């Protein structure tokens, strides 16, 4: 029901804030966008620029993705992210993670019809 592309939306949008709010943001948006569910989830990277600044990307540089697929793409610019990495401390169902804000380019997998961001790949 729910689209890839929402999934993406999900998963890695955070447009709200300007950076990571705070030593807590991993904890509290791994759990609330649902990525501590059935475990948890490692590695995970929020973007907080504009959906439309995200989809955009699927149009910038065309790179090899990590899986070896054709159809990622790097952001001209760089873009506001933060990685959650869980620490070796966390243990499920209390999964704690590791909040870092940098300013990076920024690497999605695009597909579908409208193209848009399905994976996030990596930052540069």
């Given at each position: 029901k729910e689209t890839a592309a929402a999934k993406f939306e999900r998963q890695?949008?955070?447009?709200?804030?300007?950076?990571?709010?705070?030593?807590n943001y991993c904890n509290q948006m791994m759990k609330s966008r649902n990525l501590?569910?059935?475990?948890?989830?490692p590695v995970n990277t929020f973007v907080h620029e504009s959906l439309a600044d995200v989809q955009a990307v699927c149009s910038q540089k065309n790179v090899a993705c990590?899986?070896?697929?054709?159809n990622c793409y790097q952001s001209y610019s760089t873009m506001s992210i933060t990685d959650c990495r869980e620490t070796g401390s966390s243990k499920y169902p209390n999964c704690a993670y590791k909040t870092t804000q940098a300013n990076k380019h920024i690497i999605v997998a695009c597909e579908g019809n409208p193209y848009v961001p399905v994976h996030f790949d990596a930052s540069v």
């Open positions: 890695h949008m955070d447009s709200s804030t300007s950076a990571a709010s705070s030593s501590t569910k059935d475990r948890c989830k990590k899986n070896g697929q054709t």
